[PDB]
Symmetry: D2
Subunit: 493 residues, 4 copies
């Protein structure tokens, strides 16, 4: 288990990192990146803290004590302990302002190490070379868990030699890849990328690449969005953007070389249709737990806000609060149903039921903007104009503000801090990224919908139609089509 | 365990029953009532059928084999077996067209027999009489379970000597009551009523009555709604109303006498504030399971319908189906979360978590009309005009209809039967009662909302605000009010 | 202008009419059909009543006084007078329980007589016959306006020699047609059908037929839905179904002969793509006015209901009422905007703007089920069980009901009549037809949507994009595509 | 009519202006304020430009040519010309990024000068002084129209000697006022404030003040929100925040003296219940026109966006676009209905119908967040990470981005500029203010609702209930209450 200091030092490795178009010399000291770097460094230090040993750490097969970000669950009870672990972090990061510490990112590997053989068995390699992909996965896992490396996935591809990342040479030492990966999170703050693909029509063999790639590999450029961090603002004014900003970005691979040992699979487009989705299941699980915590945070803020404003006895307000409570409890119920109806993989991994995970996500995705909008409605104008700290500190007018903007049972400053917490999260570029990330994180709503009806449980001849068929007195599609055809043959038309 | 025949015979007992204003001589033979009578009679016969022993029956403490409608759950596994039992019935009754067989009605007693003593301890009796209410409950339970009586609750009161039911004499033999109970289900088809109150402002001591009352007691008149049963229609035309109609009604008590042994509590308005709600918890549980089955039936019909019509490949249709699937899985998830987070009462009853039960109900109540509306949207005109059986049987035009209205892979008749199943349930008076019952059954949505915010978990100083307070750096209400007051005292304004 | 008596007599003409599969001897006397027949007969008598001359009648070009159901508007003021005329009828028929008296049906001809020549010019006839279609339209108009015939359109076709209506012989006297028209309204209560097509992929020349066809033509069978009329019920119990039922149906043409003079166009599928839509514009106009009146009726009932129940001072109830008011005023505003931005055809017809007409329809179609649902929510249980007249007339219990169910300021009977008016319209088969008709009347919502984006005003290069382009500093599609291509040509990729 | 230069110079007047807590020396040069100052200066210069004389200017009673921001409409045609004028400005300011140039602010005076006498007649003054308030209004109007002063209203009060603004001395020269006005727009960029009140329970005589007050009056401090202007950003990156930011703020009056001639009314709380609402009617009119233009801008951007991305042929996307079109046309229809059903005041002012104005606002207020959310849904990830100009200008990676992020028929840069225009407006603090202003501008949705039901047209005994009463056969409230009472008196209960 690494220290914060070891984590910070590992980021000073000559990586090429662009933020808003500026090349960042040192991610641990530059104002644009340093707060988030420090927040992950603290993340590592807490794991080492004895007080949090029970919830944060475990003893692995090899007998070594490791962080729960490396814990593969093998029972319902294990899954519940993982849930508690994800909650610890969503709580420690204030409802989940940072969605992708190692705990959220590493879960993408869990399906690979559970079932490595297909990654090799399905591979398509050139020139008769034979690579032990499955072995690669096992030893990858042994290294990253032992050394406590930080990894972030990049699986999404640019729409559209294509500009998409693709193999341009294979040789005895490994492969060379050129082009873009379209999006990834926390890129400047990890040691290695997990690159991969999710199948899209037209994808070629050379575009199918799954591999670990160090962030400071020659020819790799991280092109990140501008930072919305505000390290010099006053924390009263900007309580969250002062902490840091979890940057997202694209990455360009300029003839980047990857050694065979770092490759997990290449060459087979159809591999990319089934197996990455099983990896993204684990992200969805983590995300969906975050949803519920965010909804908890929202209803909490709303309770404090309407109480502070005197409106929580209005029956309309009560009624809307009740629906915020219901929004929270819906997300929580899907999380419970998912865990409770999970099952073990062939490899012995205990996996929450993705049906409840994805439909819980869908519930969040559909309604979240309504829950945020409702929280803002409760604020009134206090959100348009809420004084800065400098305004309250003015020698003459400041005491006048404290007088003018106070409530019966809460000071002006405390009450305005509720508005500012709501403004920061839902009415700033800083906060807007959070909401936008949650919207387009893995499978979005419109695709959850279309994938739902592709599932076997929900086909016309599947079991969800049994009750209806029984009520109508119908066989299956085939039986019904048979009667129809016979009615045609027994008439003339 | 009684037979269908014994059940039918028990209904021929001189009860005074009005249906649409007509006095019904014999509920087992009158066209208005007889189909439903027969459906409950079959209900009783199935319990006696060896094939369904595992799911329908159990062996009680006393060593006797009884129907699961009398089974008190004492573990999560017991609760799950009850769930399976309620599902059997919702399935046997076609998604749940009849909401109140004994299995759905009897659950109201479960909280009474679990915790009888308060019913006595809280009572307020006149003239120094002392009645063993708790003993009454225990022996009531012993009689109704042994003899397999059918019971239906009447707890709702007329709005407003009031016209509400109230005690007008107490004597050594028992009590006399006069006035109305406002609503109850299956009244003509049970042996005894469970009368009670749910607290309302202004309720007096004399208006607080909980008691078992035989349906053929002198002076008791059952005033039921008109029957929508259609025993003479063709089943192809009206597949459900031909079975029967589960009537609802009011009841007038004209100086009805009730013996002490049948009384469970009188006299204490505040008793009516806490204890009936614990009874209605068990109805809500049963109801909420039905919700999920109804949503299953709806999505099933929609799948068959859009398949039969050729529209299930339209992306919009796919998208709407997916939301019907999500409506089903939401209800199912609340049911699972409720069971999974249940707990045992002091008496040892294992009770699903009412938070997930009520919020699951709320989810159903809010959206059901949208799910029905969407199912109808899928039908198109086929719902405006769909031929009768007589139209298809016409010697010349009928074969022409079979030709005109057929689909690629389904005959005209089969396809029109899908429309007619949808019309019967959602576009007839017969079916409208179902929907209206589900809407105003126990706690309706607007009240679930207001009760939610009265719960302790969801108060401003309760734990749902902890995360928010921690993010804001706030103590509790008291701590915050303290700072405010001090800021007032440390200034001049 | 015909009398009610002349109208009734004209229905006794040997027409072959099936209702629920029963062959109806005489539509003016059969219980299933006679109430509606009588309601249209009264419709005709009111036009002749001097008291309503100003709003109901006009003096035509030929100098004769005729019913406004024959009035072609030539100015905005004319359109407003037509609006007042449609309102008279929607009001006289209680919010619009009957959607298709002559006033609503005849509007389909207005576009034909405004612009007849294309109907001929576009025609495709066999064997060198030449038919004066345009002349046919003019003389059709002269006969039906002079003799005051009642006409109903049948334009919708069965999905799928096809079973669809199609020409099977042409000869010097006229045409012969065989097959079905799929749906039409008031069929048993009109003198002649206006048959036509709306284009569908695959439609052949022989399937393109526009023609007037008398209802008692040899070989024509009207196959109507069952009647939901209740001529023998008590009006207190069923206030609307006692009046009658406006039946809908299909029609089978068994080698029906149509003389050339009755033919308006045959043979050209592409004619059916543009010209019937201009006819349906006028129905949509009429319908959309009805929408607004129905919404008026709904908010009215809701006001009376919540007042009668004591709930209209609840802020939540107030809030919902306000949204019912807004639903009404939205429909009204689209009707005003449509009239106000109308324009004259080439023929001199003043036509409301179909953009506001269709988008107003869409607003109604999307939300109506929510407005009805909200009205029902206001009723509570009173809708599940509301006494019949026979229940209130019982010598002993009836006075007890009047006592139990009364309100502070409204009797039991009056208040229950509000429930029953709501039940009749929204919770009976009788009423369900109304709602279903409004749903699938002409262009339904999903098609309004898709047609909206096909309009020229709303194309990507159309004027609705001008403001956006100006903000972005963009030319048109072509200009932008040009820059892109040049950026490709000025690089190497 | 003033020049831009004269307008700028007038802002250099020793006003005390706080922005984010910094005291601004000179509003025309400080980076925080100067862009907006320049935008209003251009506003003034355009009025003087001959090319825009027809739409921007008019010739007043006195024979002088003045800006339409001073034009009182006296006919429907005048109102339509005002509408065109407000549109010019919403278009010139890119859908309406700045909501409060003089054209939007000055409309608040229109009702005062139309009907001045009550302002005097209702006044309550101390010590027998008599002030010619009505004369004051007339001469105020003559000065501000002749000199072309810029005025902004401050009517909103702090919730709660109160901290609210109130009179603390009256004398022969005028009044002295102390305390806060809670919110106002464009404060640093106008010459004078129009201060007033909207009635709230408990308001005293001394808290009722309507008056013109110069912005640089001794003792007046403008306390504005922080600027979100970004004068040094690249316009490609931030196309709107580079222009400027229309600041909002509070104002503190430290014993500010106001001469009688500047006072329009004092002393009468009940005056504040009726007359300010007639002033805010004109703001609502202006706002509601802006709504429609904003919705035009949204649908425009959506069309360009989905076209640029290739998604505008997806039926789901088509369907959502259609609903954006319908959102626009709804707002437009309410604006047309409002103008079309307007009427002249007693003073001869032609005033749009506030029923359609407010209900159109309500439609916007309820759905706008859904329309914005839908526009963002169309963007996908492109909104999470979209390159800066510096990223595209990088010598090596920049051409690679232009390659990777281009579309078939649009360059990378152009397409990303669509995302950035959407991000700027809906996902920045800069843009969030716009949305928040529109939300809490004048009467918000929850209050439109409650005020709707207070209107006379919508009372239970008003005309919206006539149709319902006629269907039920009911008199008015009184008639019904009479029958009920008689039914009570003619029985015994």
């Amino acid at each position: 288990m690494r220290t914060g200091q070891q984590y910070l030092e590992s980021l000073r490795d000559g990586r090429q990192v662009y933020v808003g178009g500026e090349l960042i010399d040192d991610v641990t000291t530059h104002p644009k990146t340093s707060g988030y770097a420090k927040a992950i460094a603290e993340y590592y230090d807490l794991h080492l803290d004895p007080e949090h040993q029970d919830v944060l750490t475990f003893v692995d097969d090899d007998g070594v004590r490791k962080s729960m970000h490396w814990f593969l669950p093998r029972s319902k009870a294990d899954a519940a302990r993982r849930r508690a672990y994800h909650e610890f972090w969503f709580r420690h990061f204030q409802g989940g302002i940072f969605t992708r510490p190692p705990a959220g990112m590493h879960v993408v590997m869990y399906a690979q190490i559970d079932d490595p053989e297909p990654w090799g068995d399905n591979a398509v390699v050139a020139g008769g070379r034979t690579i032990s992909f499955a072995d690669n996965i096992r030893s990858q896992w042994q290294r990253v868990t032992t050394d406590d490396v930080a990894l972030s996935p990049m699986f999404v591809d640019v729409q559209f030699e294509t500009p998409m990342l693709s193999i341009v040479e294979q040789n005895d030492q490994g492969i060379v890849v050129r082009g873009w990966k379209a999006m990834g999170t926390s890129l400047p703050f990890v040691n290695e990328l997990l690159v991969g693909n999710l199948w899209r029509p037209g994808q070629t063999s050379d575009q199918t690449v799954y591999a670990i790639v160090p962030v400071n590999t020659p020819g790799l450029s991280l092109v990140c969005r501008q930072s919305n961090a505000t390290p010099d603002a006053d924390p009263y004014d900007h309580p969250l953007s002062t902490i840091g900003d979890e940057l997202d970005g694209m990455a360009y691979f300029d003839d980047v070389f990857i050694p065979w040992e770092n490759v997990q699979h290449i060459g087979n487009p159809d591999h990319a249709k089934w197996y990455p989705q099983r990896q993204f299941d684990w992200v969805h699980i983590e995300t969906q737990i975050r949803h519920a915590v965010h909804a908890e945070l929202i209803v909490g803020l709303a309770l404090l806000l309407t109480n502070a404003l005197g409106t929580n006895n209005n029956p309309i307000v009560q009624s809307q609060l009740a629906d915020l409570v219901r929004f929270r409890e819906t997300c929580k119920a899907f999380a419970i149903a998912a865990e409770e109806t999970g099952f073990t993989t062939a490899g012995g991994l205990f996996k929450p039921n993705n049906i409840y995970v994805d439909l819980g996500r869908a519930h969040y995705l559909e309604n979240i903007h309504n829950a945020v909008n409702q929280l803002i409605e409760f604020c009134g104008r206090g959100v348009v104009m809420s004084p800065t700290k400098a305004d309250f500190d003015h020698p003459f007018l400041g005491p006048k503000l404290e007088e003018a903007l106070r409530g019966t049972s809460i000071s002006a400053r405390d009450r305005v801090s509720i508005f500012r917490q709501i403004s920061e999260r839902y009415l700033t570029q800083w906060g807007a990224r959070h909401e936008m990330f949650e919207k387009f994180n893995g499978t979005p709503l419109y695709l959850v919908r279309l994938l739902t009806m592709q599932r076997t449980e929900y086909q016309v001849d599947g079991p969800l139609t049994d009750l209806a068929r029984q009520v109508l007195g119908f066989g299956d599609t085939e039986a019904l089509a048979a009667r129809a055809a016979e009615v045609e043959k027994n008439s003339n038309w």
